[PDB]
PDB file of C-alpha atoms in Angstrom:
ATOM      1  CA  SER A   1     138.003 148.643-102.686  1.00  0.00           C
ATOM      2  CA  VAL A   2     138.804 147.569-106.027  1.00  0.00           C
ATOM      3  CA  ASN A   3     141.751 148.909-108.352  1.00  0.00           C
ATOM      4  CA  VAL A   4     140.252 148.317-111.860  1.00  0.00           C
ATOM      5  CA  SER A   5     143.639 148.757-113.370  1.00  0.00           C
ATOM      6  CA  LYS A   6     145.229 146.124-111.393  1.00  0.00           C
ATOM      7  CA  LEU A   7     142.480 143.817-112.951  1.00  0.00           C
ATOM      8  CA  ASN A   8     143.144 140.373-114.766  1.00  0.00           C
ATOM      9  CA  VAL A   9     140.491 138.463-116.310  1.00  0.00           C
ATOM     10  CA  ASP A  10     142.171 136.149-118.711  1.00  0.00           C
ATOM     11  CA  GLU A  11     140.780 133.107-117.085  1.00  0.00           C
ATOM     12  CA  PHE A  12     137.103 134.424-118.262  1.00  0.00           C
ATOM     13  CA  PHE A  13     138.215 134.950-122.209  1.00  0.00           C
ATOM     14  CA  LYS A  14     139.896 131.479-122.413  1.00  0.00           C
ATOM     15  CA  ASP A  15     137.838 129.341-124.780  1.00  0.00           C
ATOM     16  CA  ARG A  16     136.066 132.239-126.407  1.00  0.00           C
ATOM     17  CA  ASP A  17     137.918 135.438-127.702  1.00  0.00           C
ATOM     18  CA  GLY A  18     136.652 138.623-126.500  1.00  0.00           C
ATOM     19  CA  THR A  19     136.815 141.887-124.664  1.00  0.00           C
ATOM     20  CA  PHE A  20     135.926 143.277-121.336  1.00  0.00           C
ATOM     21  CA  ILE A  21     135.752 147.017-120.118  1.00  0.00           C
ATOM     22  CA  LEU A  22     135.220 148.047-116.650  1.00  0.00           C
ATOM     23  CA  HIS A  23     135.242 152.045-115.945  1.00  0.00           C
ATOM     24  CA  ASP A  24     135.326 153.236-112.332  1.00  0.00           C
ATOM     25  CA  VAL A  25     132.883 156.014-112.148  1.00  0.00           C
ATOM     26  CA  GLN A  26     134.421 157.776-109.172  1.00  0.00           C
ATOM     27  CA  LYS A  27     138.054 156.774-109.628  1.00  0.00           C
ATOM     28  CA  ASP A  28     138.181 157.647-113.378  1.00  0.00           C
ATOM     29  CA  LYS A  29     140.267 154.450-114.446  1.00  0.00           C
ATOM     30  CA  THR A  30     139.191 152.494-117.231  1.00  0.00           C
ATOM     31  CA  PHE A  31     140.603 149.004-117.738  1.00  0.00           C
ATOM     32  CA  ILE A  32     140.440 147.196-121.125  1.00  0.00           C
ATOM     33  CA  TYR A  33     140.863 143.557-121.844  1.00  0.00           C
ATOM     34  CA  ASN A  34     141.931 143.091-125.424  1.00  0.00           C
ATOM     35  CA  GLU A  35     142.261 146.724-126.646  1.00  0.00           C
ATOM     36  CA  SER A  36     141.767 145.749-130.212  1.00  0.00           C
ATOM     37  CA  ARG A  37     138.438 144.308-130.007  1.00  0.00           C
ATOM     38  CA  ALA A  38     137.058 146.989-127.922  1.00  0.00           C
ATOM     39  CA  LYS A  39     138.178 149.412-130.606  1.00  0.00           C
ATOM     40  CA  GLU A  40     136.316 147.612-133.582  1.00  0.00           C
ATOM     41  CA  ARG A  41     132.863 148.536-134.752  1.00  0.00           C
ATOM     42  CA  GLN A  42     130.182 145.768-134.788  1.00  0.00           C
ATOM     43  CA  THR A  43     126.475 145.330-134.805  1.00  0.00           C
ATOM     44  CA  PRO A  44     124.724 146.606-131.330  1.00  0.00           C
ATOM     45  CA  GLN A  45     121.958 143.740-131.859  1.00  0.00           C
ATOM     46  CA  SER A  46     119.802 144.174-128.924  1.00  0.00           C
ATOM     47  CA  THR A  47     121.914 146.791-127.016  1.00  0.00           C
ATOM     48  CA  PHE A  48     120.560 149.407-129.329  1.00  0.00           C
ATOM     49  CA  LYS A  49     117.354 148.873-127.245  1.00  0.00           C
ATOM     50  CA  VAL A  50     118.653 151.313-124.653  1.00  0.00           C
ATOM     51  CA  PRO A  51     118.986 154.142-127.025  1.00  0.00           C
ATOM     52  CA  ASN A  52     115.764 153.197-129.052  1.00  0.00           C
ATOM     53  CA  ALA A  53     113.993 153.326-125.598  1.00  0.00           C
ATOM     54  CA  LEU A  54     115.560 156.658-125.255  1.00  0.00           C
ATOM     55  CA  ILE A  55     114.557 157.928-128.503  1.00  0.00           C
ATOM     56  CA  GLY A  56     111.250 156.452-128.339  1.00  0.00           C
ATOM     57  CA  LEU A  57     110.321 158.067-125.035  1.00  0.00           C
ATOM     58  CA  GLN A  58     111.868 161.486-126.086  1.00  0.00           C
ATOM     59  CA  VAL A  59     109.851 161.964-129.159  1.00  0.00           C
ATOM     60  CA  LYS A  60     106.554 160.344-127.507  1.00  0.00           C
ATOM     61  CA  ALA A  61     106.343 157.368-129.880  1.00  0.00           C
ATOM     62  CA  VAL A  62     105.766 155.369-126.548  1.00  0.00           C
ATOM     63  CA  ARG A  63     104.461 156.614-123.261  1.00  0.00           C
ATOM     64  CA  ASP A  64     106.141 154.895-120.303  1.00  0.00           C
ATOM     65  CA  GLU A  65     107.825 151.707-119.433  1.00  0.00           C
ATOM     66  CA  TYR A  66     104.445 150.189-119.506  1.00  0.00           C
ATOM     67  CA  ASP A  67     103.228 151.039-123.246  1.00  0.00           C
ATOM     68  CA  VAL A  68     101.472 147.832-124.305  1.00  0.00           C
ATOM     69  CA  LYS A  69     101.800 146.599-127.792  1.00  0.00           C
ATOM     70  CA  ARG A  70      99.563 143.501-128.452  1.00  0.00           C
ATOM     71  CA  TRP A  71     100.962 140.302-129.786  1.00  0.00           C
ATOM     72  CA  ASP A  72     100.049 139.874-133.575  1.00  0.00           C
ATOM     73  CA  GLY A  73      99.619 136.337-133.058  1.00  0.00           C
ATOM     74  CA  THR A  74     102.836 135.204-135.258  1.00  0.00           C
ATOM     75  CA  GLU A  75     104.704 132.678-133.286  1.00  0.00           C
ATOM     76  CA  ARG A  76     108.348 133.408-133.195  1.00  0.00           C
ATOM     77  CA  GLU A  77     111.564 131.630-132.050  1.00  0.00           C
ATOM     78  CA  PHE A  78     111.271 132.467-128.090  1.00  0.00           C
ATOM     79  CA  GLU A  79     108.125 131.852-126.261  1.00  0.00           C
ATOM     80  CA  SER A  80     108.626 134.815-124.046  1.00  0.00           C
ATOM     81  CA  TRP A  81     108.256 136.701-127.490  1.00  0.00           C
ATOM     82  CA  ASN A  82     104.660 135.381-128.387  1.00  0.00           C
ATOM     83  CA  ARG A  83     102.327 137.651-125.764  1.00  0.00           C
ATOM     84  CA  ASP A  84     101.786 141.070-125.203  1.00  0.00           C
ATOM     85  CA  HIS A  85     104.649 143.139-124.189  1.00  0.00           C
ATOM     86  CA  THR A  86     105.651 146.662-122.979  1.00  0.00           C
ATOM     87  CA  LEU A  87     108.665 148.735-123.478  1.00  0.00           C
ATOM     88  CA  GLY A  88     110.031 147.654-120.422  1.00  0.00           C
ATOM     89  CA  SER A  89     109.302 143.968-120.772  1.00  0.00           C
ATOM     90  CA  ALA A  90     110.144 143.756-124.263  1.00  0.00           C
ATOM     91  CA  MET A  91     113.648 145.202-123.213  1.00  0.00           C
ATOM     92  CA  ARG A  92     114.007 142.414-120.567  1.00  0.00           C
ATOM     93  CA  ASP A  93     113.519 139.583-123.212  1.00  0.00           C
ATOM     94  CA  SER A  94     114.872 141.177-126.229  1.00  0.00           C
ATOM     95  CA  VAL A  95     111.466 141.169-127.984  1.00  0.00           C
ATOM     96  CA  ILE A  96     112.724 142.566-130.997  1.00  0.00           C
ATOM     97  CA  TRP A  97     109.214 143.269-132.792  1.00  0.00           C
ATOM     98  CA  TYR A  98     108.261 145.620-129.939  1.00  0.00           C
ATOM     99  CA  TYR A  99     111.293 147.660-130.699  1.00  0.00           C
ATOM    100  CA  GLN A 100     110.663 147.268-134.069  1.00  0.00           C
ATOM    101  CA  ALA A 101     107.349 148.543-134.350  1.00  0.00           C
ATOM    102  CA  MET A 102     108.675 151.552-132.051  1.00  0.00           C
ATOM    103  CA  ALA A 103     111.474 152.537-134.534  1.00  0.00           C
ATOM    104  CA  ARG A 104     108.980 152.672-137.485  1.00  0.00           C
ATOM    105  CA  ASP A 105     107.059 155.187-135.284  1.00  0.00           C
ATOM    106  CA  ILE A 106     110.145 157.108-134.422  1.00  0.00           C
ATOM    107  CA  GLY A 107     110.766 157.447-137.989  1.00  0.00           C
ATOM    108  CA  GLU A 108     113.882 157.432-140.341  1.00  0.00           C
ATOM    109  CA  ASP A 109     114.453 161.127-139.842  1.00  0.00           C
ATOM    110  CA  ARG A 110     114.156 161.420-136.013  1.00  0.00           C
ATOM    111  CA  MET A 111     116.221 158.355-135.664  1.00  0.00           C
ATOM    112  CA  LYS A 112     118.984 159.879-138.124  1.00  0.00           C
ATOM    113  CA  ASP A 113     118.859 163.175-136.185  1.00  0.00           C
ATOM    114  CA  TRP A 114     119.074 161.721-132.515  1.00  0.00           C
ATOM    115  CA  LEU A 115     121.629 159.135-133.619  1.00  0.00           C
ATOM    116  CA  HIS A 116     124.022 162.140-134.379  1.00  0.00           C
ATOM    117  CA  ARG A 117     123.160 163.772-131.413  1.00  0.00           C
ATOM    118  CA  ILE A 118     124.465 161.133-129.097  1.00  0.00           C
ATOM    119  CA  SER A 119     127.132 160.057-131.452  1.00  0.00           C
ATOM    120  CA  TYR A 120     126.354 156.415-131.649  1.00  0.00           C
ATOM    121  CA  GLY A 121     128.789 154.736-133.676  1.00  0.00           C
ATOM    122  CA  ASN A 122     128.573 154.941-137.272  1.00  0.00           C
ATOM    123  CA  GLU A 123     125.018 156.352-137.052  1.00  0.00           C
ATOM    124  CA  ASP A 124     124.040 154.435-140.359  1.00  0.00           C
ATOM    125  CA  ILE A 125     120.647 153.449-140.622  1.00  0.00           C
ATOM    126  CA  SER A 126     120.700 152.735-144.330  1.00  0.00           C
ATOM    127  CA  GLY A 127     119.695 149.096-143.440  1.00  0.00           C
ATOM    128  CA  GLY A 128     116.311 150.117-142.858  1.00  0.00           C
ATOM    129  CA  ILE A 129     114.240 152.012-140.053  1.00  0.00           C
ATOM    130  CA  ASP A 130     113.206 148.553-138.403  1.00  0.00           C
ATOM    131  CA  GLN A 131     116.751 146.657-139.414  1.00  0.00           C
ATOM    132  CA  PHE A 132     119.736 148.850-139.322  1.00  0.00           C
ATOM    133  CA  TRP A 133     120.784 147.408-135.705  1.00  0.00           C
ATOM    134  CA  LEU A 134     120.448 143.970-136.563  1.00  0.00           C
ATOM    135  CA  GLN A 135     123.194 142.635-138.620  1.00  0.00           C
ATOM    136  CA  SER A 136     122.882 145.722-140.864  1.00  0.00           C
ATOM    137  CA  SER A 137     124.503 149.020-141.589  1.00  0.00           C
ATOM    138  CA  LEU A 138     124.809 150.525-137.876  1.00  0.00           C
ATOM    139  CA  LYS A 139     127.934 149.480-135.954  1.00  0.00           C
ATOM    140  CA  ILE A 140     129.429 150.824-132.853  1.00  0.00           C
ATOM    141  CA  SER A 141     132.622 149.663-131.106  1.00  0.00           C
ATOM    142  CA  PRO A 142     132.323 148.294-127.464  1.00  0.00           C
ATOM    143  CA  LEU A 143     134.590 151.063-126.146  1.00  0.00           C
ATOM    144  CA  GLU A 144     131.761 153.592-127.820  1.00  0.00           C
ATOM    145  CA  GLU A 145     129.209 151.286-125.988  1.00  0.00           C
ATOM    146  CA  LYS A 146     130.837 151.909-122.703  1.00  0.00           C
ATOM    147  CA  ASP A 147     131.044 155.459-123.406  1.00  0.00           C
ATOM    148  CA  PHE A 148     127.275 155.956-124.204  1.00  0.00           C
ATOM    149  CA  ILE A 149     126.550 153.781-121.205  1.00  0.00           C
ATOM    150  CA  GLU A 150     128.763 155.968-118.916  1.00  0.00           C
ATOM    151  CA  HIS A 151     127.017 159.056-120.166  1.00  0.00           C
ATOM    152  CA  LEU A 152     123.455 157.398-119.576  1.00  0.00           C
ATOM    153  CA  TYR A 153     124.833 156.810-116.048  1.00  0.00           C
ATOM    154  CA  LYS A 154     125.906 160.288-115.460  1.00  0.00           C
ATOM    155  CA  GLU A 155     122.651 161.729-117.329  1.00  0.00           C
ATOM    156  CA  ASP A 156     125.001 163.645-119.541  1.00  0.00           C
ATOM    157  CA  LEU A 157     122.807 162.917-122.611  1.00  0.00           C
ATOM    158  CA  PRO A 158     120.353 165.439-124.237  1.00  0.00           C
ATOM    159  CA  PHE A 159     117.308 163.337-122.959  1.00  0.00           C
ATOM    160  CA  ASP A 160     114.868 164.270-120.341  1.00  0.00           C
ATOM    161  CA  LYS A 161     116.312 163.560-116.855  1.00  0.00           C
ATOM    162  CA  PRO A 162     113.152 161.504-116.012  1.00  0.00           C
ATOM    163  CA  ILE A 163     113.327 159.511-119.235  1.00  0.00           C
ATOM    164  CA  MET A 164     117.017 158.580-118.610  1.00  0.00           C
ATOM    165  CA  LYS A 165     115.852 157.037-115.299  1.00  0.00           C
ATOM    166  CA  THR A 166     112.919 155.393-116.636  1.00  0.00           C
ATOM    167  CA  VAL A 167     115.304 153.421-119.112  1.00  0.00           C
ATOM    168  CA  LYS A 168     117.798 152.955-116.441  1.00  0.00           C
ATOM    169  CA  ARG A 169     115.337 151.347-114.211  1.00  0.00           C
ATOM    170  CA  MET A 170     114.329 149.105-117.166  1.00  0.00           C
ATOM    171  CA  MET A 171     117.875 147.746-117.067  1.00  0.00           C
ATOM    172  CA  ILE A 172     117.810 146.358-113.654  1.00  0.00           C
ATOM    173  CA  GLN A 173     119.066 142.741-113.939  1.00  0.00           C
ATOM    174  CA  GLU A 174     119.324 141.831-110.000  1.00  0.00           C
ATOM    175  CA  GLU A 175     118.555 143.911-107.099  1.00  0.00           C
ATOM    176  CA  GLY A 176     120.921 142.315-104.406  1.00  0.00           C
ATOM    177  CA  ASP A 177     121.316 143.318-100.896  1.00  0.00           C
ATOM    178  CA  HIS A 178     124.744 144.988-101.591  1.00  0.00           C
ATOM    179  CA  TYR A 179     124.311 145.737-105.271  1.00  0.00           C
ATOM    180  CA  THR A 180     121.961 146.443-108.326  1.00  0.00           C
ATOM    181  CA  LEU A 181     122.960 145.099-111.416  1.00  0.00           C
ATOM    182  CA  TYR A 182     122.121 147.273-114.681  1.00  0.00           C
ATOM    183  CA  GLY A 183     122.360 145.893-118.275  1.00  0.00           C
ATOM    184  CA  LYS A 184     121.480 144.781-121.719  1.00  0.00           C
ATOM    185  CA  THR A 185     122.314 141.874-123.617  1.00  0.00           C
ATOM    186  CA  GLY A 186     122.788 141.262-127.465  1.00  0.00           C
ATOM    187  CA  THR A 187     123.206 138.045-129.517  1.00  0.00           C
ATOM    188  CA  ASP A 188     123.419 136.757-132.847  1.00  0.00           C
ATOM    189  CA  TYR A 189     126.018 135.455-135.468  1.00  0.00           C
ATOM    190  CA  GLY A 190     128.126 133.865-132.758  1.00  0.00           C
ATOM    191  CA  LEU A 191     128.472 137.168-131.112  1.00  0.00           C
ATOM    192  CA  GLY A 192     127.339 138.419-127.427  1.00  0.00           C
ATOM    193  CA  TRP A 193     126.706 141.694-125.890  1.00  0.00           C
ATOM    194  CA  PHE A 194     126.502 142.635-122.223  1.00  0.00           C
ATOM    195  CA  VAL A 195     126.534 146.351-121.535  1.00  0.00           C
ATOM    196  CA  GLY A 196     125.391 148.053-118.318  1.00  0.00           C
ATOM    197  CA  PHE A 197     126.431 149.271-114.849  1.00  0.00           C
ATOM    198  CA  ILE A 198     126.595 148.026-111.055  1.00  0.00           C
ATOM    199  CA  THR A 199     126.078 150.180-108.004  1.00  0.00           C
ATOM    200  CA  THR A 200     127.262 149.357-104.405  1.00  0.00           C
ATOM    201  CA  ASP A 201     127.560 151.402-101.466  1.00  0.00           C
ATOM    202  CA  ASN A 202     129.895 154.121-102.267  1.00  0.00           C
ATOM    203  CA  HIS A 203     130.690 152.319-105.853  1.00  0.00           C
ATOM    204  CA  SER A 204     129.226 152.229-109.202  1.00  0.00           C
ATOM    205  CA  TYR A 205     131.050 150.932-112.335  1.00  0.00           C
ATOM    206  CA  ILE A 206     130.447 150.928-115.990  1.00  0.00           C
ATOM    207  CA  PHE A 207     131.227 147.630-117.986  1.00  0.00           C
ATOM    208  CA  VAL A 208     131.025 146.183-121.471  1.00  0.00           C
ATOM    209  CA  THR A 209     131.570 142.425-122.092  1.00  0.00           C
ATOM    210  CA  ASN A 210     131.728 141.456-125.981  1.00  0.00           C
ATOM    211  CA  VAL A 211     132.639 137.727-126.867  1.00  0.00           C
ATOM    212  CA  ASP A 212     132.313 135.078-129.477  1.00  0.00           C
ATOM    213  CA  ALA A 213     129.366 133.425-127.569  1.00  0.00           C
ATOM    214  CA  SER A 214     125.962 134.520-126.684  1.00  0.00           C
ATOM    215  CA  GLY A 215     124.340 137.335-124.943  1.00  0.00           C
ATOM    216  CA  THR A 216     123.745 135.191-122.046  1.00  0.00           C
ATOM    217  CA  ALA A 217     127.375 134.044-122.229  1.00  0.00           C
ATOM    218  CA  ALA A 218     128.354 137.493-122.206  1.00  0.00           C
ATOM    219  CA  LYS A 219     126.064 138.367-118.971  1.00  0.00           C
ATOM    220  CA  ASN A 220     127.587 135.341-117.135  1.00  0.00           C
ATOM    221  CA  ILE A 221     131.167 136.470-117.930  1.00  0.00           C
ATOM    222  CA  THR A 222     130.531 139.859-116.596  1.00  0.00           C
ATOM    223  CA  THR A 223     128.617 138.807-113.386  1.00  0.00           C
ATOM    224  CA  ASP A 224     131.645 136.439-112.927  1.00  0.00           C
ATOM    225  CA  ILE A 225     134.152 139.083-113.424  1.00  0.00           C
ATOM    226  CA  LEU A 226     132.170 141.309-110.947  1.00  0.00           C
ATOM    227  CA  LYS A 227     132.196 138.390-108.354  1.00  0.00           C
ATOM    228  CA  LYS A 228     135.698 137.910-108.363  1.00  0.00           C
ATOM    229  CA  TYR A 229     136.378 141.512-107.495  1.00  0.00           C
ATOM    230  CA  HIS A 230     133.713 141.334-104.484  1.00  0.00           C
ATOM    231  CA  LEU A 231     131.261 143.701-106.569  1.00  0.00           C
ATOM    232  CA  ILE A 232     128.384 141.168-106.622  1.00  0.00           C
ATOM    233  CA  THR A 233     127.740 138.921-103.736  1.00  0.00           C
ATOM    234  CA  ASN A 234     124.359 138.787-102.347  1.00  0.00           C
TER     235      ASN A 234
END
């Protein structure tokens, strides 16, 4: 079994400055590469979709993971964005407009009320009910991202128990034979997020990758770190 305090991932953060956080749930040991970066607050970008999904389900602004919002016909950057989407599928492809239509329904007040309840970074939605998390006022540190995620894994959050399990199922990236990979990406302005967790037989871990590349680059670093420590196989 892995000792997450003997970890070294320098070979993975060559060619792009970033940070990595892996917390053994059972053994209660957190490893941090580049403690400095892990401690500074940044835009959550699309990682905020996980809290936005919880609040939106909690206050019944959307129904389940399948709540359909029809595409408005505006053709946007990515083609996966230009079709009908649900809550889950919009979390899969980071379809910003779905979660934007949802945050408008959640409302300034309930979004400020819940952000202070789950202590998400600086809680500042001053940038707009549908903008604060996208290169704007709201900013959270990767370490605060790990903590939030850890809470959602343990279900220590003040959301309904089935709601947290609906959001966590939505974050599934790979259902391997010996592990289930959970996580959300975030991308923009040369900064990439990957936040989630991984379960094996008798083990589960919270991780947070943050790097000067894309989200996809952040996820590929994470899955590479996890492969180097026998956490991801097949």
